[PDB]
């Protein structure tokens, strides 16, 4: 009504707006922080892929239990979420895709195991009813790869003792600055010379595919 | 309009054309006509026409006009500015950043407009 | 009939019906309407156009217009 | 509308109805410019029921007819209490909201939702 | 004569350089690598590893465990940015076990996460 | 520049002639799902196919409703427009060429059905024998031209 | 199946050459209508203009 | 062969289809100008009855 | 209180002396520039190097404009 009130609403909006106009600007800022981030990872999982794949030909008498695949009816998931809000449809398109590919196995008759990180997974399921196994949250924007050993270790160990037949991750792929991907990725159903192995080719393999699933999911 | 009987095309510029309308506005006041929306005077829209309507082309010659155009309080809505934009063909914006860049003269090709 | 498909098929004119044109300077409402008395020179309708507050130099396009369409007689 | 002269039932309808809208409309601004996703869970369940009961107030008109060519509804007043309760409980959370825009009454809004 | 050489972490390069000599603790043994050496694979135990250089003589990095990858014109170290071993590694998976919030035993065969999914998708949308 | 989703017209619908009064009670509702679904352009290529598809309409009848000044239609040439947009004639049309399409099926009827031009101009008339001519039309227009 | 090869690719060959051909004509019967009601239009508004 | 074919069918309704467009569209240009030049010359022949 | 942004002389610089008429366009640039990147001065640690280094000058360019009253320089 009056021309007094409507003066301070656009001095509201207005301050609002710079401050959003601000947060722009740091959101860059953090993206390029973290895009280096990713690039630091990937010379250690592509080494690791490499030698995991020329030991596993090298040496035919063993097969790693996640080298094989058990055709049965219990799976296991991975849920990747953020801990603050501000996004546009970032959890909510990875939710969507999360249901999906989830009814899937509900309709097959198969159970499911869930393993979450980030406060909004947390709620999500803590609403909804989701039976979590193992959570971990509140990790920062630099997070560190050893708070990541104990959620993915409890669910190495269901797999390796049978509970679980098939295990995915659920996360966003970084097509492009504008554009987020949300997919679901299997994890546990993986130069003519060979090496030394100074402790048994056996045991490394045991070793390196632990090393292997961890840095799938700290990536 | 001399000049344009000769059989010539002339400019007419005028140096601020609200001022035009403030001075009708101060002579209706003093002669004690009740004053129309927003205080201008009743006879607002026919003293533009009659200035307006001389500046055309004729069959002998003609007398293209470019006015200097003020807002009052940035609106575009008042009645000085909306009066007046019911006469003008063409608007031309003189821009502070393309002056910045060297580049003369300052006019925004996004923001001038044109009738024709 | 307009002439216009929008108009003709969303927003259809009647004889005898009062139909307003509205909007902000300079977006086609002179058109719609001289358009739709353009439109009548075969339709046995018979038309007026009243000019208020017009330039004259606007008045004489308008005329113009309707004579190179044979709407004028 | 005095509980003496409509009863408890309809007076606390219609009470429950007006607190919902109310509520939603003090959310306009936060949901401009921010949308439904930074609200609480209690007011994301409010704005939903809110949504619904706008689009369940609409009506088909029998004089309007000539204007859609949808047929006219009439609602017993039985009806009206129902559908809105019903809407206030949560019996219709499952419903999409489009399902209640031009329906006479809740059963209505049932067998639209199933196309 | 000298050999490339990489040591890499699961997060980033502790170090990469031309070396004359590598000198680390194996799971078996200590060892001594050269350029031209045959493939080697081993487990490396918590300790220091030293590189050898013109100048750079005594370049020593200290490692949490991980593994030595070697051949004859490459070697890497596969660290670790902490110490694996079953004391800590298993108190970490009882945390993640013991961190899992509980207050309603859902089925997981619930509907309505498509009914939310889908009215949270659409108001994003208007947003915009 | 009409905006369908304000304008009206009272008195109107007893008056439209019966063949754009049977063809245009689909071109109204048509642009209100465009009005709601046009922003998302930008990222409709990820939707559900009921979205899609009403989208991809609205944007075809929305182009299709442009036009010229000066260039008025008779009952008949308005009349193919509108029945190509109804029946879904333009799914396979990209929304670049809508344009160019009419002006096409309005020149080709103009030599090849001169005679149901002239019937449908008389008075608007739309009867079974009409609907048969324009589809059989319009089939050999997508068909050959 | 090396001459079954041939013979349907040369045989689809002709359809593609005998359709590309018609969409030619129809295209020229659209030219020659196209300056046909053009040089109509021109005879009806130089009538106008004389009769101005 | 049979790929190769099929690549040389589609070409040939491709360079059909952008022939047929610009047959059409320089049929416009000269409907075009045919209205232009019908316009002019009876423009002129007004000019010269009225100043006679 | 000057505010730099809407205050103006049509004269300018026909009414300033060579020494101030030489130092004061990089000031009225800092100023312009301060303005603009005053909202961003609370996340100061995550911004470019560059426009840190503008944001730095137009602080102290902005500071340096106080002065008492009754002490004309
Ligand atoms: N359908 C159309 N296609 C292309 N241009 C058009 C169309 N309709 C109108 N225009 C153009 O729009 C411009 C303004 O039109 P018009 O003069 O009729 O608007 P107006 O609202 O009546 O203007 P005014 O307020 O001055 O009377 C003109 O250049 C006109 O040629
Ligand atoms: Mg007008």
Not at chain 5, 50 to 63: A, D, F, P
Not at chain 6, 4 to 33: E, N, Y
Not at chain 6, 112 to 120: F, R, T, V
């Amino acid at each position: 009504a009056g021309a007094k009130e409507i003066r301070s609403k656009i001095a509201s909006i207005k301050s609002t707006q710079k401050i959003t106009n601000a947060m722009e600007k740091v959101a860059v800022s953090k993206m390029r922080k973290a895009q280096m981030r990713m690039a630091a990872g990937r010379p250690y999982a592509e080494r690791i892929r490499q030698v995991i794949g020329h030991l596993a030909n090298a040496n035919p008498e063993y097969r790693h239990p996640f080298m094989v695949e058990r055709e049965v009816k219990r799976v296991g998931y991975i849920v990747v979420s953020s801990d603050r809000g501000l996004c546009g449809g970032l959890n909510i398109n990875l939710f969507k895709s999360l249901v999906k590919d989830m009814s899937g196995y509900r309709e097959q008759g198969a159970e499911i195991d869930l393993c979450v990180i980030g406060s909004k997974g947390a709620s999500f399921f803590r609403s909804f009813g989701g039976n979590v196994v193992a959570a971990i949250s509140h990790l920062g924007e630099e997070p560190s790869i050893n708070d990541l050993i104990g959620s993915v270790k409890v669910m190495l160990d269901a797999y390796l003792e049978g509970r679980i037949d098939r295990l995915f991750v659920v996360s966003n792929k970084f097509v492009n600055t504008m554009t987020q991907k949300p997919t679901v990725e299997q994890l546990i159903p993986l130069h003519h010379w060979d090496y030394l192995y100074e402790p048994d080719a056996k045991s490394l393999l045991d070793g390196l595919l632990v090393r292997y699933v961890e840095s799938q999911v700290y990536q | 309009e001399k000049f344009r009987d000769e059989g010539r095309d002339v400019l007419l510029f005028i140096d601020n054309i609200y001022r035009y309308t403030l001075a009708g506005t101060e002579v209706s006041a003093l002669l004690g006509r009740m004053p129309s929306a927003v205080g201008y005077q009743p006879t607002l829209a026919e003293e533009m026409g009659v200035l307006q309507e001389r500046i055309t082309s004729t069959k002998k010659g003609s007398i293209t006009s470019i006015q200097a155009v003020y807002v009052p309080a940035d609106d575009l809505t008042d009645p000085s500015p909306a009066t007046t934009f019911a006469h003008l063909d063409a608007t031309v914006v003189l821009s502070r950043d393309i002056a910045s860049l060297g580049i003369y003269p300052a006019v925004d090709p996004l923001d001038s407009t044109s009738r024709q | 009939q307009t002439g216009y498909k929008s108009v003709d098929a969303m927003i259809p004119v009647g004889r005898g019906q009062r139909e307003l044109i509205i909007g902000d300077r300079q977006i086609g409402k002179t058109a719609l309407a001289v358009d739709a008395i353009i439109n009548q020179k075969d339709s046995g309708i018979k038309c007026v156009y009243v000019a208020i507050g017009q330039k004259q130099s606007t008045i004489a396009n308008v005329v113009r217009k309707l004579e190179e369409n044979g709407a004028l007689a | 509308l005095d509980p003496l002269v409509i009863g408890q039932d309809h007076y606390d309808t219609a009470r429950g109805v007006q607190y919902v809208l109310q509520r939603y409309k003090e959310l306009k601004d936060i949901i401009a410019i921010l949308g439904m996703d930074e609200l609480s869970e209690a007011d994301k369940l409010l704005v939903a029921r809110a949504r619904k009961i706008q689009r369940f107030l609409s009506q088909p008109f029998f004089v309007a007819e000539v204007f859609t060519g949808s047929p006219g509804k009439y609602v017993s007043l039985k009806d009206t209490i129902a559908g809105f309760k019903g809407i206030l409980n949560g019996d219709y959370d499952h419903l999409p909201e489009q399902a209640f825009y031009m329906v006479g009454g809740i059963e209505e809004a049932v067998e639209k939702a199933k196309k | 004569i000298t050999v490339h050489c990489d040591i890499v972490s699961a997060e980033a390069e502790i170090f990469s350089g031309l070396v004359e000599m590598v000198i680390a603790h194996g799971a078996l043994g200590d060892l001594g690598i050269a350029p031209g050496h045959a493939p080697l694979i081993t487990d490396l135990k918590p300790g220091p590893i030293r590189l050898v250089k013109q100048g750079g003589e005594q370049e020593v990095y200290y490692i949490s465990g991980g593994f030595l990858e070697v051949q004859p014109n490459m070697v890497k170290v596969l660290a670790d940015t902490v110490v694996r071993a079953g004391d800590l590694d298993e108190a970490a998976a009882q945390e993640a076990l013991k961190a899992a919030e509980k207050a309603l035993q859902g089925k997981g065969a619930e509907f309505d996460y498509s009914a939310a999914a889908a009215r949270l998708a659409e108001a994003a949308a208007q947003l915009r | 520049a009409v905006n369908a989703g304000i304008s009206v017209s009272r008195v109107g619908g007893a008056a439209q002639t019966k063949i754009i009064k049977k063809l245009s009670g689909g071109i109204r509702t048509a642009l209100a799902q465009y009005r709601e679904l046009a922003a998302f352009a930008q990222f409709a290529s990820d939707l559900d196919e009921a979205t899609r598809k009403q989208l991809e309409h609205g944007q075809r009848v929305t182009e299709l409703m442009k036009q010229k000044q000066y260039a008025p239609m008779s009952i008949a040439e308005m009349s193919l427009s509108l029945y190509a947009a109804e029946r879904g004639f333009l799914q396979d049309v990209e929304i670049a060429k809508v344009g160019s399409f009419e002006q096409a099926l309005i020149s080709y009827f103009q030599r090849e059905h001169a005679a149901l031009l002239a019937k449908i101009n008389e008075k608007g008339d739309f009867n079974d024998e009409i609907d048969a001519g324009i589809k059989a039309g319009i089939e050999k227009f997508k068909a050959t031209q | 199946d090396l001459e079954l090869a041939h013979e349907k690719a040369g045989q689809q060959l002709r359809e593609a050459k005998a359709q590309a051909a018609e969409i030619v004509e129809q295209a020229k019967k659209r030219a020659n209508q196209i300056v046909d009601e053009a040089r109509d239009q021109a005879r009806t508004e130089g009538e106008r203009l004389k009769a101005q």
